[PDB]
Amino acid sequence: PKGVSVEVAPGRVKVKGPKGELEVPVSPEMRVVVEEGVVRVERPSDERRHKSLHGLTRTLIANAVKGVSEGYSKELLIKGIGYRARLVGRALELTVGFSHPVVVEPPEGITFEVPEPTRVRVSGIDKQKVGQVAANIRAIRKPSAYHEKGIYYAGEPVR
Amino acid sequence: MKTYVPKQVEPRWVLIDAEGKTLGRLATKIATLLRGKHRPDWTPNVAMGDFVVVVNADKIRVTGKKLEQKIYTRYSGYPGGLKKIPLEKMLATHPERVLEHAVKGMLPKGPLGRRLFKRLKVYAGPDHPHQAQRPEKL
Amino acid sequence: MKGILGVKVGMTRIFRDDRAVPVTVILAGPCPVVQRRTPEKDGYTAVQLGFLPQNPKRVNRPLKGHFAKAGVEPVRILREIRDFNPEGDTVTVEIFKPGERVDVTGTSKGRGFAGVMKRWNFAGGPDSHGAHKIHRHPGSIGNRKTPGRVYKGKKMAGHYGAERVTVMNLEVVDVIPEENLLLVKGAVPGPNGGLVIVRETKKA
Amino acid sequence: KVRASVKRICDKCKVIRRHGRVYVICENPKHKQRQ
RNA sequence: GAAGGGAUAACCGCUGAAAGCAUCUAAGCGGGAAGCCCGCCCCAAGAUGAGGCCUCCCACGGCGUCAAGCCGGUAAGGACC
RNA sequence: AGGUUUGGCACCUCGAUGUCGGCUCGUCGCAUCCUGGGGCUGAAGAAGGUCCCAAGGGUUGGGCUGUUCGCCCAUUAAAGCG
């Protein structure tokens, strides 16, 4: 991942790249650093405690990687009447039935992209930032009001 | 016939802090210290012992979880309420006590243990702006 | 938190558009500020105002005239204003523009040893039928063996009155900086000629 | 949304065990439970 | 009565192993109540852990084994009436 | 499971522990009658049904009976149980 700069410390990991550096704090166990032209992770015991705590990081870091290497995505939908949004700078204001339009605060490190009035996506480097920003959204409208209304992801609805 | 009595000693203090310790596991040793239980010139009726001083309060580990698991009922106003308080609170809202209490329930119940608790001097330091002879013990 | 000592003086009513208003006439007066208390100093952060002027050197040792305002310490004593700190040189009165809401504080009139059911609007007892000696009486006060005592709060006959009262959100009607006055919504504790201290509502 | 002797209505009714409560549930709010 | 802060219940979620899939959970993180803690009001330093600040009054005159355990006048102030 | 009913036993009290009901004054419990949240629904909406958090605060006035209780009248967010 040539664009990556994997820094290692006691129990934390600073991953740098074309996008930015991030903190991936982990357990003071393993002292797993960067072995080879890539990154590895080991463990001590075979205790359900470690195995679980292990691998968990295998992924963890692995994301700081893909993250800097252009990690964005987070698409949304709509449907109905005034169910749409008009990007106001870095934040948006989508309206949905509510007698008062909704102004969604613009999170830092996270970018809001309004492709159209309907479809919408959240762009940014992380997850805890993006996903947490799935609430900031879907939380506006539900789903099964015998469908149509409400915003969605990219997945599919159920009657 | 025999006898074994000590004259008027001279309070030899002690400055201390092992915030890397578990209060209690520590407190005891502090209490043990308080009353002259280590110094071989015993007299449970006298009131001679270290003037123990603990700095760098809190920072104290505390085994398993006391995230509201450790409650401090301690307070019973009088009309209908027995105000309870979890650890987290004391830590944030003025700690020190955390350890203080741990010491009280280790010092004897009389006006003495009452007097001995008067010796203990804990602060949320580091910094014990109150000494002229800190003999930091390990 | 705009302070200002003052004294209740009575009350009447005025009009507006076409509706009558109950107004109590407070009389705050120029309050020679005579002390401050910065966190570096005392630790709070307030202002020691002063009131009733004239005073034939009955100041003795606490002359504390180390502030021009001295003007002969106003025996009507001084009382801070928790978080106030204006241009130290007499707190005007024009501190309040009409339509503002204050939180007046004063001393409730002393009702002496008040009887329960006056002190607590208790029921009392039949003025007929049943007995005749327990008319005004608190009835029972406890239970039996358990708990076996009176609660540490039971309301009982007692000294009631002459106390610290604080009525809130009183609308400031008119303000006569001329003769130095203040008008509000009647509900202000204490007899006329009382040490009352006007503040600023906490509705916000 | 329940309390005893369950065999897992439908497979969708996966046992969701969190905090302390053992509430198993499918996609179906009818096939939903909570110990 | 409240605004408003903070921490939570049930519960709603993001990331995510153990278990290559998947899960709100195990390490992690968000939102969540007339409720909880802090706010509003009142008491309150007998809080012997006896707090803080501002301004005042100022020297032993004489008695053992020397800090009074003893008196004779004060001061600033304080009571009496 | 709880100790609110009806009972069993006969341990303290027979040189005495006044025993229904009302009134007055209440305080506590949650197994919640309202008012706060929430999951399901054979939930379109408005209603409901059920289970889960949660007592901060509420929890009316009359007719009949000594009544507690009930049944009625008129309301209510509700007219909670112990």
From Swiss-Prot, chain A:
One Pfam family it belongs to: Ribosomal_L6
Any Gene Ontology CC annotation: cytosolic large ribosomal subunit
GO MF annotations in UniProt: rRNA binding; structural constituent of ribosome
InterPro entries cross-referenced by the UniProt entry: Ribosomal_uL6-like (IPR000702), Ribosomal_uL6-like_a/b-dom_sf (IPR036789), Ribosomal_uL6_a/b-dom (IPR020040), Ribosomal_uL6_bac-type (IPR019906)
Taxonomic superkingdom: Bacteria
Gene3D superfamilies documented for this protein: Ribosomal protein L6, alpha-beta domain (3.90.930.12)
GO terms classed as biological process: cytoplasmic translation
Keywords linked to the UniProt accession: Ribonucleoprotein, Ribosomal protein, RNA-binding, rRNA-binding
Segments crossing the lipid bilayer: none
Subunit: Part of the 50S ribosomal subunit.
Function: This protein binds to the 23S rRNA, and is important in its secondary structure. It is located near the subunit interface in the base of the L7/L12 stalk, and near the tRNA binding site of the peptidyltransferase center.
Similarity annotation: Belongs to the universal ribosomal protein uL6 family.
Protein name: Large ribosomal subunit protein uL6
Curated annotation (Swiss-Prot), chain B:
InterPro entries documented for this protein: Ribosomal_uL13, Ribosomal_uL13_bac-type, Ribosomal_uL13_CS, Ribosomal_uL13_sf
Keywords recorded for this protein, A-Z: Ribonucleoprotein, Ribosomal protein
Keyword Ribosomal protein included in the entry's annotation: yes
Listed GO CC annotations: cytosolic large ribosomal subunit
GO biological process: negative regulation of translation; translation
Gene3D superfamilies: Ribosomal protein L13
PANTHER family on file: LARGE RIBOSOMAL SUBUNIT PROTEIN UL13M, RIBOSOMAL PROTEIN L13
Entry protein name: Large ribosomal subunit protein uL13
Source organism (scientific name): Thermus thermophilus (strain ATCC 27634 / DSM 579 / HB8)
UniProt lineage: Bacteria, Thermotogati, Deinococcota, Deinococci, Thermales
From Swiss-Prot, chain C:
Keywords tagged on the record: Methylation, Ribonucleoprotein, Ribosomal protein, RNA-binding, rRNA-binding
A GO term from the CC aspect: cytosolic large ribosomal subunit
Keyword Ribosomal protein: yes
Known partners and oligomeric status: Part of the 50S ribosomal subunit. Forms a cluster with proteins L14 and L19.
Pfam families on file: Ribosomal_L3
GO molecular function: rRNA binding; structural constituent of ribosome
Entry-linked SUPFAM superfamilies: Translation proteins
GO biological process, one term: translation
Family matches, as PANTHER family: 50S RIBOSOMAL PROTEIN L3 (PTHR11229), LARGE RIBOSOMAL SUBUNIT PROTEIN UL3C (PTHR11229:SF16)
Lineage, uppermost ranks: Bacteria, Thermotogati, Deinococcota, Deinococci, Thermales
Known function: One of the primary rRNA binding proteins, it binds directly near the 3'-end of the 23S rRNA, where it nucleates assembly of the 50S subunit.
Gene field: rplC
Posttranslational modification: The mass differences between the observed and calculated masses are suggested to be due to methylation, which is known to occur in the E.coli and R.palustris orthologs.
Record-given protein name: Large ribosomal subunit protein uL3
Family: Belongs to the universal ribosomal protein uL3 family.
InterPro entries linked to this entry: Ribosomal_uL3 (IPR000597), Ribosomal_uL3_bac/org-type (IPR019927), Ribosomal_uL3_CS (IPR019926), Transl_B-barrel_sf (IPR009000)
From Swiss-Prot, chain D:
Gene Ontology biological process terms in this record: translation
Any Gene Ontology CC annotation: ribonucleoprotein complex
Tagged with keyword Glycoprotein: no
The entry's keywords: Ribonucleoprotein, Ribosomal protein
Record-linked Pfam families: Ribosomal_L36
Keyword match Ribonucleoprotein: yes
MF GO annotations: structural constituent of ribosome
Family: Belongs to the bacterial ribosomal protein bL36 family.
Name this protein carries in UniProt: Large ribosomal subunit protein bL36
